[PDB]
Write an enzyme that holds these catalytic residues in place. Sequence first.
Site, PDB file in Angstrom:
ATOM      1  N   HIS A 126      -0.050 -13.545  -0.987  1.00  0.00           N
ATOM      2  CA  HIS A 126      -1.184 -13.898  -0.405  1.00  0.00           C
ATOM      3  C   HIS A 126      -1.157 -15.402   0.133  1.00  0.00           C
ATOM      4  CE1 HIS A 126      -4.485 -11.025  -1.901  1.00  0.00           C
ATOM      5  NE2 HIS A 126      -3.432 -10.417  -1.398  1.00  0.00           N
ATOM      6  N   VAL A 134       3.739 -20.507   5.803  1.00  0.00           N
ATOM      7  CA  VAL A 134       4.803 -21.179   5.144  1.00  0.00           C
ATOM      8  C   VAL A 134       4.653 -20.641   3.515  1.00  0.00           C
ATOM      9  CG1 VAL A 134       5.790 -23.139   3.993  1.00  0.00           C
ATOM     10  CG2 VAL A 134       4.654 -23.477   6.160  1.00  0.00           C
ATOM     11  N   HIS A 161       0.783  -1.201  -0.186  1.00  0.00           N
ATOM     12  CA  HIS A 161       0.034  -0.046   0.092  1.00  0.00           C
ATOM     13  C   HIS A 161       0.707   1.199  -0.082  1.00  0.00           C
ATOM     14  CE1 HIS A 161      -4.095  -2.100   1.210  1.00  0.00           C
ATOM     15  NE2 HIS A 161      -3.471  -2.756   0.301  1.00  0.00           N
TER      16      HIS A 161
HETATM   17  C1  HEM Z   1      -3.795  -7.549  -6.938  1.00  0.00           C
HETATM   18  C2  HEM Z   1      -3.808  -6.608  -5.844  1.00  0.00           C
HETATM   19  C3  HEM Z   1      -4.024  -6.836  -4.601  1.00  0.00           C
HETATM   20  C4  HEM Z   1      -5.510  -6.963  -4.090  1.00  0.00           C
HETATM   21  C5  HEM Z   1      -6.750  -6.448  -4.892  1.00  0.00           C
HETATM   22  C6  HEM Z   1      -5.409  -7.419  -2.429  1.00  0.00           C
HETATM   23  C7  HEM Z   1      -6.298  -7.394  -1.685  1.00  0.00           C
HETATM   24  C8  HEM Z   1      -6.125  -8.076  -0.250  1.00  0.00           C
HETATM   25  C9  HEM Z   1      -7.268  -7.685   0.651  1.00  0.00           C
HETATM   26  C10 HEM Z   1      -8.682  -7.428   0.282  1.00  0.00           C
HETATM   27  C11 HEM Z   1      -6.845  -8.348   1.695  1.00  0.00           C
HETATM   28  C12 HEM Z   1      -7.535  -8.792   2.910  1.00  0.00           C
HETATM   29  C13 HEM Z   1      -7.348  -7.611   4.173  1.00  0.00           C
HETATM   30  C14 HEM Z   1      -7.999  -7.748   5.151  1.00  0.00           C
HETATM   31  O1  HEM Z   1      -9.315  -7.496   5.298  1.00  0.00           O
HETATM   32  O2  HEM Z   1      -7.653  -7.989   6.408  1.00  0.00           O
HETATM   33  C15 HEM Z   1      -5.417  -8.902   1.459  1.00  0.00           C
HETATM   34  C16 HEM Z   1      -4.629  -9.374   2.282  1.00  0.00           C
HETATM   35  C17 HEM Z   1      -3.276  -9.413   2.233  1.00  0.00           C
HETATM   36  N1  HEM Z   1      -2.586  -8.961   1.028  1.00  0.00           N
HETATM   37 FE1  HEM Z   1      -3.355  -8.492  -0.565  1.00  0.00          FE
HETATM   38  N2  HEM Z   1      -4.086  -7.741  -2.273  1.00  0.00           N
HETATM   39  C18 HEM Z   1      -3.422  -7.656  -3.747  1.00  0.00           C
HETATM   40  C19 HEM Z   1      -2.059  -7.652  -3.884  1.00  0.00           C
HETATM   41  C20 HEM Z   1      -1.031  -7.957  -2.698  1.00  0.00           C
HETATM   42  C21 HEM Z   1       0.353  -7.730  -2.874  1.00  0.00           C
HETATM   43  C22 HEM Z   1       1.068  -7.216  -4.155  1.00  0.00           C
HETATM   44  C23 HEM Z   1       0.946  -7.946  -1.637  1.00  0.00           C
HETATM   45  C24 HEM Z   1       2.182  -8.048  -1.237  1.00  0.00           C
HETATM   46  C25 HEM Z   1       3.346  -7.982  -1.754  1.00  0.00           C
HETATM   47  C26 HEM Z   1      -0.219  -8.396  -0.702  1.00  0.00           C
HETATM   48  C27 HEM Z   1      -0.319  -8.692   0.493  1.00  0.00           C
HETATM   49  C28 HEM Z   1      -1.184  -9.395   1.441  1.00  0.00           C
HETATM   50  C29 HEM Z   1      -1.101  -9.962   2.681  1.00  0.00           C
HETATM   51  C30 HEM Z   1       0.243 -10.423   3.370  1.00  0.00           C
HETATM   52  C31 HEM Z   1      -2.437 -10.083   3.117  1.00  0.00           C
HETATM   53  C32 HEM Z   1      -2.629 -10.557   4.651  1.00  0.00           C
HETATM   54  C33 HEM Z   1      -3.058  -9.443   5.532  1.00  0.00           C
HETATM   55  C34 HEM Z   1      -3.371 -10.219   6.931  1.00  0.00           C
HETATM   56  O3  HEM Z   1      -3.504 -11.460   6.891  1.00  0.00           O
HETATM   57  O4  HEM Z   1      -3.615  -9.658   8.030  1.00  0.00           O
HETATM   58  N3  HEM Z   1      -1.516  -8.245  -1.378  1.00  0.00           N
HETATM   59  N4  HEM Z   1      -4.963  -8.200  -0.059  1.00  0.00           N
HETATM   60  O1  LIG Z   2      -6.128  -4.463   0.940  1.00  0.00           O
HETATM   61  C1  LIG Z   2      -6.690  -3.999  -0.230  1.00  0.00           C
HETATM   62  N1  LIG Z   2      -6.069  -4.051  -1.439  1.00  0.00           N
HETATM   63  O2  LIG Z   2      -4.692  -4.460  -1.569  1.00  0.00           O
HETATM   64  C2  LIG Z   2      -8.226  -3.508  -0.131  1.00  0.00           C
HETATM   65  C3  LIG Z   2      -8.675  -2.849  -1.195  1.00  0.00           C
HETATM   66  C4  LIG Z   2      -9.922  -2.391  -1.369  1.00  0.00           C
HETATM   67  C5  LIG Z   2     -10.658  -2.632  -0.214  1.00  0.00           C
HETATM   68  C6  LIG Z   2     -10.419  -3.388   0.958  1.00  0.00           C
HETATM   69  C7  LIG Z   2      -8.994  -3.776   1.015  1.00  0.00           C
HETATM   70  O3  LIG Z   2      -8.526  -4.528   2.317  1.00  0.00           O
HETATM   71 CA   LIG Z   3       1.318 -20.672   2.326  1.00  0.00          CA
HETATM   72 CA   LIG Z   4       3.947   5.744  -0.579  1.00  0.00          CA
END
Ligand code: HEM
Ligand SMILES: O=C(NO)c1ccccc1O
Ligand SMILES: [Ca+2]
Ligand SMILES: [Ca+2]
EC number: 1.11.1.7
Length: 336
Positions: free
Chosen positions: A176, A199, A48
């Site tokens: 993810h 992991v 972000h």
């Molecule tokens: C293609 C764009 C992406 C979208 C639309 C997206 C969206 C999201 C959303 C909606 C969540 C859930 C957050 C929550 O409600 O707690 C999430 C979690 C997460 N995302 Fe993504 N993500 C994307 C790309 C990435 C990238 C590029 C990374 C990092 C290099 C990343 C790392 C994470 C991690 C590690 C979590 C877990 C957070 C937790 O467990 O508390 N995401 N992502």
């Molecule tokens: O984490 C996000 N994008 O990476 C995210 C984007 C839009 C709404 C909720 C979300 O958690």
């Molecule tokens: Ca895994």
């Molecule tokens: Ca910045």
Amino acid sequence: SVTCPGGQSTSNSQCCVWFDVLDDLQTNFYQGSKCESPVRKILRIVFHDAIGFSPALTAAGQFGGGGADGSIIAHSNIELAFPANGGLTDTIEALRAVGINHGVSFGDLIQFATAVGMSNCPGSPRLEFLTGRSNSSQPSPPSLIPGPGNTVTAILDRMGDAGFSPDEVVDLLAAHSLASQEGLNSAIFRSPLDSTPQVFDTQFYIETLLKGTTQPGPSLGFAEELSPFPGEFRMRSDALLARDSRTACRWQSMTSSNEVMGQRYRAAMAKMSVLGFDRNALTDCSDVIPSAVSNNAAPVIPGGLTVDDIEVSCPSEPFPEIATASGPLPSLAPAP
Ligand code: HEM
Ligand SMILES: O=C(NO)c1ccccc1O
Ligand SMILES: [Ca+2]
Ligand SMILES: [Ca+2]
Ligand SMILES: *[C@@H]1O[C@H](CO)[C@@H](O[C@@H]2O[C@H](CO)[C@@H](O)[C@H](O)[C@H]2NC(C)=O)[C@H](O)[C@H]1NC(C)=O
Ligand SMILES: *[C@@H]1O[C@H](CO)[C@@H](O)[C@H](O)[C@@H]1O
């Protein structure tokens, strides 16, 4: 080259302060070098922070954002009000204190805490770490962070503007594999996105391709899709990217080799870490980053599912021969 006060050898004296923030983060932020919520939250924060960077806005005469500048911490008052940034406040405050306490820039500290946190999670590659990003930033423009309800075209355009090809978007999503959600469906808080949230492996690519069969909670949350088994959460953008013809073959290639996945993710993350900066102006302090323990488990299609349960979407290459597991369908516990 240099010997830091603690007797460690490093390439440049500018690296020596990072061994002190390494120790504080491991002891405190990561609670004894654990791979739990602080690491997952930092991974969402580095994305972000770095993605608030838009060449198109700059071209149109507007401020397009400074990229990996730590503006999400320096300007948390404005950026944490963006809807993509919920659930991040507590982690941003903890990071703010470490930064102020060690006298390091916020942009550098977020890149460093990501490389150190990943080292706590088995199977992770050693990420590159560069130091020298200026501590000055302006607030990121709104609307530059991809959302789970966005179309694939929308995500590819946003990501493309920032500088990533469709392939690199898939590579970046390996993060993810260490993930849960807390705010899309609060009724199943910390439901994992793959079966091994601790992991760094290929399971996320395999599991998002399986047929959506199960509703894990009482209702469906924002941008929620049916998942392959109890406890696992599936978000729309991941389901769609796994299946869209523009990204499907790269997604499928990521399923059988943790080694290829890690090399690809390391390369895309090095690119993301310097958005808004000239890496030739930064100092390499990668030797400060410790090795993670290796992951020795092979990729599997879990709980009795077979190839017939994956929705093969790459029309040109056959799905890889992945091992199947002889068991009942797993039920995933919340990510720790
Ligand atoms: C293609 C764009 C992406 C979208 C639309 C997206 C969206 C999201 C959303 C909606 C969540 C859930 C957050 C929550 O409600 O707690 C999430 C979690 C997460 N995302 Fe993504 N993500 C994307 C790309 C990435 C990238 C590029 C990374 C990092 C290099 C990343 C790392 C994470 C991690 C590690 C979590 C877990 C957070 C937790 O467990 O508390 N995401 N992502
Ligand atoms: O984490 C996000 N994008 O990476 C995210 C984007 C839009 C709404 C909720 C979300 O958690
Ligand atoms: Ca895994
Ligand atoms: Ca910045
Ligand atoms: C980087 O810049 C931020 C301001 O954008 C500095 O943060 C402030 O630091 C003082 C003490 O030095 C704190 O009392 C403030 O609360 C901080 N403000 C914010 C918004 O965090 C930070 O000190 C700078 N770091 C360096 C090494 O120059
Ligand atoms: C599988 O079982 C876990 C606990 O083992 C639950 O968290 C999940 O909702 C599903 O029932």
